[PDB]
Amino acid sequence: QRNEEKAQREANKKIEKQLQKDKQVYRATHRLLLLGAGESGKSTIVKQMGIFETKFQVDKVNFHMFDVGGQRDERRKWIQCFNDVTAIIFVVASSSYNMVITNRLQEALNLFKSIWNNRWLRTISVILFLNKQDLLAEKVLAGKSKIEDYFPEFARYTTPEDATPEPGEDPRVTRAKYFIRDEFLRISTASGDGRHYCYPHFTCAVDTENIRRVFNDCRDIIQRMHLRQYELL
Amino acid sequence: QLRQEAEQLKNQIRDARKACADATLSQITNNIDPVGRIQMRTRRTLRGHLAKIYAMHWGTDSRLLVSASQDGKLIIWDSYTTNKVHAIPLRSSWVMTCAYAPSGNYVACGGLDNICSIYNLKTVRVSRELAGHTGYLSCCRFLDDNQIVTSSGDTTCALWDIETGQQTTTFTGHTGDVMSLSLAPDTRLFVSGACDASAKLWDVREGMCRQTFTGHESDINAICFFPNGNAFATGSDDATCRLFDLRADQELMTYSHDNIICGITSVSFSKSGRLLLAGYDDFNCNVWDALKADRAGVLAGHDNRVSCLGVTDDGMAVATGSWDSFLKIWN
Amino acid sequence: EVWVVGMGIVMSLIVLAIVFGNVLVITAIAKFERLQTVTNYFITSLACADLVMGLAVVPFGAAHILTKTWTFGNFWCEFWTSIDVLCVTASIETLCVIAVDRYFAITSPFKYQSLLTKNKARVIILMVWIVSGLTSFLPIQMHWYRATHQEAINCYAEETCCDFFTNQAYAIASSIVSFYVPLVIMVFVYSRVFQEAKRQLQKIDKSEGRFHVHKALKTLGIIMGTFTLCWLPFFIVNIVHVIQDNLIRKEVYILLNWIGYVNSGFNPLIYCRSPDFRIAFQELL
Amino acid sequence: QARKLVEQLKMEANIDRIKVSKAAADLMAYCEAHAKEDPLLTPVPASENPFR
Numbered sequence: 001q002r003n004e005e006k007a008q009r010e011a012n013k014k015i016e017k018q019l020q021k022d023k024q025v026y027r028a029t030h031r032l033l034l035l036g037a038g039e040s041g042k043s044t045i046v047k048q049m050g051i052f053e054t055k056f057q058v059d060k061v062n063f064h065m066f067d068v069g070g071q072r073d074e075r076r077k078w079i080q081c082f083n084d085v086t087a088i089i090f091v092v093a094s095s096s097y098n099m100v101i102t103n104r105l106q107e108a109l110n111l112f113k114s115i116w117n118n119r120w121l122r123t124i125s126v127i128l129f130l131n132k133q134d135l136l137a138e139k140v141l142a143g144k145s146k147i148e149d150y151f152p153e154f155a156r157y158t159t160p161e162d163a164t165p166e167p168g169e170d171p172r173v174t175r176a177k178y179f180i181r182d183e184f185l186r187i188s189t190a191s192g193d194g195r196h197y198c199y200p201h202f203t204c205a206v207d208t209e210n211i212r213r214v215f216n217d218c219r220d221i222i223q224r225m226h227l228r229q230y231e232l233l
Numbered sequence: 234q235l236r237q238e239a240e241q242l243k244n245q246i247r248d249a250r251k252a253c254a255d256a257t258l259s260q261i262t263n264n265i266d267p268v269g270r271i272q273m274r275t276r277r278t279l280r281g282h283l284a285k286i287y288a289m290h291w292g293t294d295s296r297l298l299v300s301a302s303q304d305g306k307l308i309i310w311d312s313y314t315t316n317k318v319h320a321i322p323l324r325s326s327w328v329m330t331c332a333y334a335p336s337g338n339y340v341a342c343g344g345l346d347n348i349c350s351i352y353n354l355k356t357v358r359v360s361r362e363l364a365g366h367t368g369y370l371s372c373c374r375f376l377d378d379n380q381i382v383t384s385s386g387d388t389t390c391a392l393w394d395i396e397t398g399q400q401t402t403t404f405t406g407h408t409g410d411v412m413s414l415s416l417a418p419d420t421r422l423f424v425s426g427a428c429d430a431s432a433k434l435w436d437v438r439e440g441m442c443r444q445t446f447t448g449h450e451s452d453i454n455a456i457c458f459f460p461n462g463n464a465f466a467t468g469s470d471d472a473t474c475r476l477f478d479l480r481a482d483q484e485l486m487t488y489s490h491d492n493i494i495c496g497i498t499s500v501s502f503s504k505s506g507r508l509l510l511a512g513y514d515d516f517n518c519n520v521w522d523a524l525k526a527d528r529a530g531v532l533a534g535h536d537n538r539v540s541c542l543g544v545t546d547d548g549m550a551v552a553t554g555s556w557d558s559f560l561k562i563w564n
Numbered sequence: 565e566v567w568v569v570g571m572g573i574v575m576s577l578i579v580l581a582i583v584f585g586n587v588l589v590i591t592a593i594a595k596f597e598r599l600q601t602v603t604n605y606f607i608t609s610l611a612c613a614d615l616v617m618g619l620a621v622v623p624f625g626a627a628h629i630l631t632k633t634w635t636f637g638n639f640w641c642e643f644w645t646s647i648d649v650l651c652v653t654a655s656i657e658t659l660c661v662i663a664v665d666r667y668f669a670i671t672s673p674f675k676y677q678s679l680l681t682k683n684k685a686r687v688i689i690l691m692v693w694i695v696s697g698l699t700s701f702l703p704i705q706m707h708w709y710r711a712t713h714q715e716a717i718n719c720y721a722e723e724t725c726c727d728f729f730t731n732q733a734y735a736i737a738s739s740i741v742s743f744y745v746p747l748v749i750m751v752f753v754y755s756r757v758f759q760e761a762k763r764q765l766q767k768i769d770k771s772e773g774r775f776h777v778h779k780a781l782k783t784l785g786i787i788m789g790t791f792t793l794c795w796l797p798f799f800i801v802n803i804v805h806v807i808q809d810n811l812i813r814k815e816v817y818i819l820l821n822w823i824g825y826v827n828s829g830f831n832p833l834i835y836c837r838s839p840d841f842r843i844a845f846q847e848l849l
Numbered sequence: 850q851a852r853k854l855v856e857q858l859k860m861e862a863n864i865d866r867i868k869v870s871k872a873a874a875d876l877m878a879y880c881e882a883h884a885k886e887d888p889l890l891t892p893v894p895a896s897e898n899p900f901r
């Protein structure tokens with residue numbers, strides 16, 4: 001009868017030591033959620049990097065990315081699980097503005113609006129990836145399936161002077177790319193209170209620096225979180 | 234053509250249920266004495282979890298309980314001495330439910346991975362990995378030492394056999410992601426609720442849906458079954474909690490207040506069935522007088538949202554595990 | 565009499581404000597589990613230092629000023645002086661380590677979680693308090709701070725008078741250990757934090773210039789200006805009166821010392837403006 | 850599809866049900882009978898209470 005308490009105390013001490021080690025390991029790593037459409041090209045981003053988890057480390061920092069496979073349901077109740085993630089990586093194909101499979105771009109905009117305006121994901125920032133940039137350029141310069149017909153607001157839109165055009169680029173596709181970015185940006189800024197931001201990136205399949213981009217975006221996210229905990233920023 | 238027949242059948246069901254409304258539960262229960270105010274103090278606080286807790290399950294003996302968290306740890310506590318008997322790492326970090334076998338030898342857990350893992354406590358390794366679901370698995374309960382029912386986001390509930398690892402019986406026809414299920418005191422029957430407002434009753438042996446109830450207006454996050462075996466109360470994302478009756482086929486009373494607008498994540502009944510304890514999206518937890526639908530007391534000790542609620546078999550203790558790692562035992 | 569009564573009322577108000585704020589902060593941190601954090605441990609250390617200040621050295625000093633006589637023993641005078649030095653240096657060094665914590669959390673965010681933990685926070689607080697003790701108790705209890713000139717020895721011989729007379733070496737060393745080194749550390753870390761905040765603001769403006777969507781300036785201004793305007797005027801004259809014997813009068817020295825004391829009560833207002841602390845205070849009262 | 854749904858509703862329709870008054874009376878009687886052995890409803894003595 002007396003030895004039972006001692007055995008329980010020893011087991012508790014061993015479990016507590018293991019839990020402290022797990023505390024260190026868990027706090028070391030960062031968790032990211034990968035959301036996108038099936039044709040958005042998330043597989044391309046995964047290759048560069050029920051549920052698929054890929055672990056990558058850069059600059060001796062452990063990053064854990066979780067991609068939810070299947071579960072193709074409009075209603076998302078599992079998404080409340082990803083409340084402690086560092087960021088939500090959103091992948092959208094900007095070249096799919098014309099595909100019927102409600103346009104794909106409009107469906108992605110609606111999905112981004114739903115994710116942004118979620119009670120659980122209030123503090124979680126979103127990293128936005130715009131794949132198939134080359135395909136978008138090929139479509140825009142082709143002269144077929146103009147943005148204006150699919151997106152009426154494109155006609156009134158004007159290219160922003162305070163932009164960063166590519167070193168070798170065509171003004172028409174630059175206008176298209178910045179309009180596609182600005183749609184998501186205005187969805188982001190309409191309801192954000194400064195607790196979470198959106199980082200739009202023009203990515204490509206050939207590009208291999210997306211890991212560095214996600215690392216920088218996570219650094220900025222944590223830095224802004226720490227700044228906003230205090231009255232600064 | 235068939236849609237007209239379905240509409241006629243639904244109208245017939247509505248008329249038949251309206252015919253049995255002899256007197257509401259409020260009219261009969263208004264004569265009985267009020268339960269009064271119940272104040273509950275946190276007797277034990279259990280610490281050691283790393284992330285938010287989703288589900289717990291009291292043991293058949295009131296001493297032991299098991300809890301699950303987003304670290305991937307399935308910690309088993311001795312609630313009397315606040316001692317972690319076992320700490321079970323999980324293959325997948327995401328887990329949304331847990332269960333503790335009535336014999337006390339097995340523990341099961343499952344999450345966004347469709348596989349349901351069953352652990353052998355007395356031997357701690359994975360005795361069997363139950364696979365076959367398509368969506369995220371939401372709840373688990375042990376019918377016996379060899380049978381387990383799992384409800385997933387596949388909009389189906391399944392009955393498993395641990396020895397063979399196959400779905401002995403599959404329950405279908407339920408239009409939403411099933412969130413929670415509860416068993417009768419006897420093994421014969423169980424009930425479940427999903428994202429659609431409908432909560433359905435099932436028969437384990439036959440595998441067919443005997444009854445359905447559509448009282449709610451939003452997703453049914455939680456469900457609990459009355460100790461008498463003839464009623465069950467379901468929580469919802471809507472602030473209402475409603476008590477249904479199997480023999481009557483419609484709700485008897487509704488538990489809500491205009492002050493509260495948050496949803497309900499976990500419900501449970503006291504041993505006598507008088508007190509209906511229900512967790513809420515806001516930080517506190519509420520205690521409802523089931524007979525009279527008057528809030529008896531409030532259990533406010535949690536910093537974050539309450540995700541799991543349980544009452545032990547003998548009714549001595551009430552355990553609440555919120556989205557902070559702290560799990561508290563009330564009494 | 566009227567002036568004495570007014571001064572007594574003012575010092576009593578100061579003492580009550582200090583003790584009330586510090587006990588409120590300490591009990592808010594102790595009672596609520598969510599208020600326990602690595603930074604909140606440093607906050608608790610600073611609150612404890614200010615509470616010991618307001619309980620031990622402010623009321624006794626007020627009584628000494630009003631009565632114009634030290635009724636207690638000479639050992640009690642030494643003990644009061646030592647606790648005064650201990651409290652001041654502990655509070656200032658705790659402010660310095662809080663600034664270092666903020667700098668490490670902002671400048672290097674990825675490695676911040678591993679760099680500082682609860683055990684490391686406890687070790688840091690213990691080191692700060694041991695440094696404070698070695699600065700205060702050792703030279704005073706062992707009487708290494710005793711001056712040489714006739715006024716100091718006359719004051720020390722008389723048990724009814726308790727005045728502060730210190731050597732050049734101890735005054736310089738105590739000032740450097742207490743204020744100037746933490747002042748330099750805080751200034752550097754807060755300048756770096758301001759630069760990082762401005763860089764982040766410029767990045768946000770670049771990303772969302774066309775859409776609609778100061779504070780850092782106000783926050784750093786209050787945080788650094790309160791501490792500086794409270795303690796720098798005292799420490800400059802602390803060095804000067806040692807350097808120049810006739811430059812600083814006793815009344816000016818005591819007035820600047822009490823202005824420095826007021827920082828103990830000002831600290832909880834600055835360092836407990838977070839919404840969680842506000843919720844805890846509202847629930848307590 | 851729709852045939853399965855209409856068959857399910859048809860099977861569900863033909864079930865005997867009791868009046869709400871009888872079910873509520875049974876629930877109230879059960880609660881009154883088992884209220885005695887309810888540690889939550891009636892606080893247990895400190896010696897009897899295991900946790901405290």
Ligand SMILES: CN[C@@H]1CCc2c(ccc(O)c2O)[C@H]1O
Pocket residue numbers: 645648649652653728735738739742821
């Ligand atoms: C009696 N007043 C003392 C005298 C000198 C001194 C103080 C505080 C901190 C220091 O580091 C000091 O050297 C003052 O509070």
